[PDB]
Design a binder for this molecule. Structure first.
Ligand SMILES: *[C@@H]1O[C@H](CO)[C@@H](O[C@@H]2O[C@H](CO)[C@@H](O[C@@H]3O[C@H](CO[C@@H]4O[C@H](CO)[C@@H](O)[C@H](O[C@@H]5O[C@H](CO)[C@@H](O)[C@H](O)[C@@H]5O)[C@@H]4O)[C@@H](O)[C@H](O[C@@H]4O[C@H](CO)[C@@H](O)[C@H](O)[C@@H]4O)[C@@H]3O)[C@H](O)[C@H]2NC(C)=O)[C@H](O)[C@H]1NC(C)=O
Ligand SMILES: *[C@@H]1O[C@H](CO)[C@@H](O[C@@H]2O[C@H](CO)[C@@H](O[C@@H]3O[C@H](CO[C@@H]4O[C@H](CO)[C@@H](O)[C@H](O)[C@@H]4O)[C@@H](O)[C@H](O[C@@H]4O[C@H](CO)[C@@H](O)[C@H](O)[C@@H]4O)[C@@H]3O)[C@H](O)[C@H]2NC(C)=O)[C@H](O)[C@H]1NC(C)=O
Ligand SMILES: O=C(c1cnc(NCc2cnccn2)nc1)N1CCC2(CCOCC2)C1
Ligand SMILES: *[C@@H]1O[C@H](CO)[C@@H](O)[C@H](O)[C@H]1NC(C)=O
Ligand SMILES: *[C@@H]1O[C@H](CO)[C@@H](O)[C@H](O)[C@H]1NC(C)=O
Ligand code: NA
Length: 461
């Protein structure tokens, strides 16, 4: 059993913004301008045989808001248990034109539609957690099935910097929907860096596939959307449908269809202002049983290199301990606190004016989000000056004939990333061993930007 998956990268029409909140008529007009574009992708995906389509986070109204400017865009989204086809019973829950339009899009195209809209929940001064506003406002994913029925409603648990227009639910929402093409879980953007509900869906609810609306801002070398989202899919052994906003000026680009063994389709484009529809087949019930012990090999072996010139280098505001790679081939070990990283490599050639380093990081990230990390990275330094190792490098010339990366990870949640020049994924050029080694299966098809083992220590957050 296989199915055809679809994701759409969306160049959104953002509201003029801001000063005074718009009328419900003006908010609806804007939302319908974005929905007209999404209708275009949904109908094409359905005409091309897709079983499900994911659209991005904030694709219908953007991200520039305060609590009051957002309010006119909001709908009261009922509990999916209510058993409702908004297309077949338009006024069951009052004025809900966005829900009705999404339901009709799913129903008329006989396709599952995943979209991200806004939920309004009015509350009384009686409950202590009710905002002084008189309502809760949630960043919400909605899922409509092939018949137009509301089958999932998910309120974003992990809010990003400046998402003050939204509230956090009391308890993390573990939202799943079952189909004839596998069990599905759902979360949004920043949720991918946290345990709840992301890890819970996979390890406890045993989902086959994650549907993921996102408005991701690319942060090289480790947090580029295609790179990190496919790594997370591989580390969690799940299918992953990443639908991202298309906005190059904010570094937003990177949608794909990821399988547990490799990426199946991906899109990165910083040049045009156009959206993109991606389609690809996936196994409905992929194997989830390919277990990895991430510290195994690394904890067994002794330091590959001795007495070396180690330097501190900044990677996304985090101070890594690096060791420059010297020679077209080598074996290095670098440690930072509780983490020891090992690399075995062989380059295709010793390209001039291009420096590579092996970095180690064990610590808490605090800039624009608080999360505990353990990272082992083989990265292309921006220039030849070692104080540029860890800075965003979009191009490289060095192809690798072989690599083997591993670390003494104090966690079972490690995401294996392989990124080529210029933000290209490498499918299926690498694998992960049961021992915890990220290794090449072939010489890389393009020059290497990074080979990273990105680990999360959720308990140390
Ligand atoms: C979400 O929806 C899914 C899909 O509907 C639900 O999963 C289904 O659950 C049913 C109830 O437990 C399962 O039915 C039983 O199936 C076995 C036969 O084994 C299966 O053979 C199938 C055909 O060859 C195959 O599709 C199926 O799935 C596969 O399982 C293997 C491991 O074995 C795995 O590798 C694959 O990834 C895939 O999962 C099995 O191989 C029957 O023996 C069994 O007996 C009957 O009980 C009936 C009463 O329930 C009775 O009518 C009858 O007389 C027998 O006594 C059931 O028919 C079904 O296999 C399973 N399907 C899948 C794809 O998982 C899932 O439960 C839902 N989840 C939630 C949370 O709601
Ligand atoms: C993934 O793979 C790793 C590697 O195998 C697993 O980690 C190992 O788990 C072992 C338990 O199954 C640990 O063994 C214990 O070690 C204790 C202390 O040993 C020191 O630990 C360092 C690492 O921190 C090692 O280098 C050295 O071995 C040190 O000496 C011992 O106290 C403990 O002893 C037991 O005592 C009882 C009696 O009370 C005896 O009956 C028993 O036979 C045994 O002697 C035990 O040996 C091992 O340290 C640990 N290694 C590391 C590096 O963490 C992971 O747990 C696997 N992960 C998953 C999720 O499966
Ligand atoms: O959740 C996110 C979001 C989360 N992470 C990233 N990039 C990785 C990363 C991780 N930690 C720190 C910094 N960067 N990009 C976007 N967004 C939600 C909507 C949103 C629209 C742009 O303006 C702001 C708010 C971004
Ligand atoms: C769906 O079809 C019904 C009639 O079959 C129509 O009323 C509705 O406007 C359609 N909606 C969309 C978005 O295609
Ligand atoms: C690196 O280690 C491997 C395996 O032990 C070995 O075959 C290779 O020759 C080593 N290379 C260097 C330059 O140390
Ligand atoms: Na805001």
């Amino acid at each position: 059993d296989t199915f055809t998956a679809a994701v759409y990268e969306h160049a959104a029409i953002l509201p003029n913004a801001t000063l005074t909140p718009v009328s419900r008529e003006e908010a609806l007009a804007l939302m319908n301008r974005n929905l007209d574009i999404l209708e275009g992708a949904i109908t094409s995906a359905a005409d091309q045989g897709a079983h499900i389509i994911v659209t991005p986070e904030d694709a219908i109204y953007g991200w520039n808001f305060n609590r009051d400017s957002l309010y006119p865009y909001l709908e009261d989204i009922p509990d999916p248990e209510v058993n409702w086809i908004p297309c077949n019973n338009r006024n069951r829950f009052g004025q809900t034109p966005v829900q009705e339009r999404l339901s009709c899009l799913a129903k008329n195209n006989s396709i599952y539609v995943v979209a991200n809209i806004g939920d309004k929940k009015p509350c009384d001064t009686s409950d202590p957690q009710c905002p002084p506003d008189g309502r809760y406002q949630y960043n919400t994913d909605v899922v409509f099935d092939s018949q137009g029925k509301l089958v999932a409603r998910y309120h974003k648990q992990n809010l990003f910097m400046g998402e003050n227009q939204f509230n956090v639910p009391k308890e993390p929402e573990i939202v799943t929907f079952n189909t004839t093409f596998g069990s599905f879980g759902i979360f949004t953007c920043f949720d991918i860096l946290f345990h709840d509900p992301a890890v819970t869906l996979v390890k406890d609810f045993h989902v086959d596939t994650i549907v993921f609306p996102t408005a991701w801002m690319n942060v090289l070398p480790h947090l580029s959307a295609v790179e990190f989202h496919s790594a997370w899919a591989m580390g969690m052994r799940v299918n992953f449908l990443a639908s991202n906003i298309h906005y190059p000026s904010k570094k937003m680009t990177g949608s794909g269809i990821y399988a547990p063994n490799s990426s199946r389709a991906f899109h990165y484009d910083m040049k045009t202002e156009e959206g993109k529809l991606l389609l690809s087949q996936l196994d409905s019930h992929p194997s989830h049983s390919a277990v990895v012990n991430w510290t195994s090999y690394a904890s067994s072996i002794e330091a590959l290199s001795s007495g070396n010139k180690e330097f501190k280098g900044t990677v996304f505001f985090d101070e890594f301990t690096f060791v420059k790679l010297t020679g077209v081939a080598g074996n290095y070990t670098v440690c930072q606190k509780d983490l020891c990283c090992h690399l075995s490599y062989k380059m295709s050639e010793n390209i001039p004016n291009e420096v590579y380093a092996l970095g180690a990081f064990d610590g808490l990230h605090t800039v624009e989000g608080r999360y505990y990390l353990q990272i082992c990275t083989l990265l292309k330094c921006k220039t030849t000056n070692l104080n540029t190792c860890g800075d965003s490098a979009e191009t490289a010339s060095t192809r690798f004939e072989m690599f083997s990366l591993s670390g003494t990870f104090g966690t079972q949640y490690v995401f294996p990333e392989v990124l080529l020049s210029e933000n290209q994924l490498a499918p299926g050029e690498f694998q992960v061993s049961t021992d915890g080694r990220l290794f090449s299966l072939k010489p890389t098809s393009g020059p290497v930007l990074t080979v990273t083992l990105f680990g999360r220590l959720y308990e140390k957050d």
